[PDB]
């Protein structure tokens, strides 16, 4: 059983949200929509198919992507320990948006393949409980 507006699949409840938020705000927002809520987690082919189709029902634009709940915990820009020449990373000059540690799915693959995106980007998302 799921709250009004939420769709169920294998004992879980899902809901796509059209408002654009950063990965973090989206996650936080989900925790407040329903008890135990979080950004969606895709743990199997079946779930990926269901979530992909659910998303496709509301999102029909290609100018954005949809946030899923997988993210690289590390604060660093990258997790490599050294350059190909062995030297340590003692200097960086990244363009902020180029560090893509949050994942999302895009309409180009029918919302299936996980693509790396800049975490502070604002995009639609899916909550699961």
């Amino acid at each position: 059983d799921c709250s009004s507006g939420w769709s169920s699949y294998e004992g879980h409840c899902y809901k796509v949200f059209k408002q654009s938020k950063t990965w973090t705000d989206a996650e936080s927002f989900c925790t407040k929509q329903v008890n135990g809520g979080h950004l969606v987690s895709i743990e199997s082919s079946g779930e990926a198919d269901f979530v992909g189709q659910l998303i496709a029902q509301k999102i029909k634009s290609a100018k954005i992507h949809v946030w899923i709940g997988l993210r690289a915990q590390n604060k660093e820009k990258q997790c490599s320990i050294e350059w190909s020449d062995g030297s340590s990373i003692s200097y960086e000059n990244w363009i902020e948006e180029e560090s893509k540690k949050c994942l999302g799915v895009h309409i180009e693959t029918g919302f299936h393949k996980w693509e790396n995106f800049y975490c502070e980007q604002q995009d639609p998302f899916v909550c699961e409980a």
Binding site: H38, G69, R71, Q78, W83
Partner: protein, 123 residues
């Protein structure tokens, strides 16, 4: 001192190439150009500006591989609901770092991508 076909800077030798290769092939290629040679590494802003100017004045506009690969492969990837990460469907397996011959800013793209590159070694 660097061979005639390389440019020197702070005791190091650099050389751009315009034979399009993916990251792995570029690195391997660099090692065969001279002993100690690898894809360029940046330890400072001055070195970065040097190499960028070098690449532009030689091939103009283009993207050039940098010596950083599989940048997020060893990161701590976790689902926010604490679920175990088993099933996966990555669009790209690994990301590598490159720069455009127009500025010293680091950019990321899939390591499968085809691009130019710059080799470097200690003289």
């Amino acid at each position: 001192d660097c061979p005639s076909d390389w440019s020197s800077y702070e005791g190091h030798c650099y050389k751009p190439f315009n034979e399009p290769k993916n990251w792995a092939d570029a690195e391997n290629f660099c090692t065969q150009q001279h002993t100690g040679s690898h894809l360029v590494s940046f330890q400072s802003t001055e070195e970065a500006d040097f190499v960028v100017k070098l690449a532009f004045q030689t091939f103009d506009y283009g993207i050039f591989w940098m010596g950083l690969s599989k940048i997020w492969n060893q990161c701590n990837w976790q689902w926010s609901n604490a679920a175990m990460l088993k099933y996966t469907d990555w669009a790209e397996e690994s990301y590598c770092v490159y720069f455009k011959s127009t500025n010293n800013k680091w950019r990321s793209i899939t390591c499968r991508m085809i691009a130019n590159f710059v080799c470097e070694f200690q003289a």
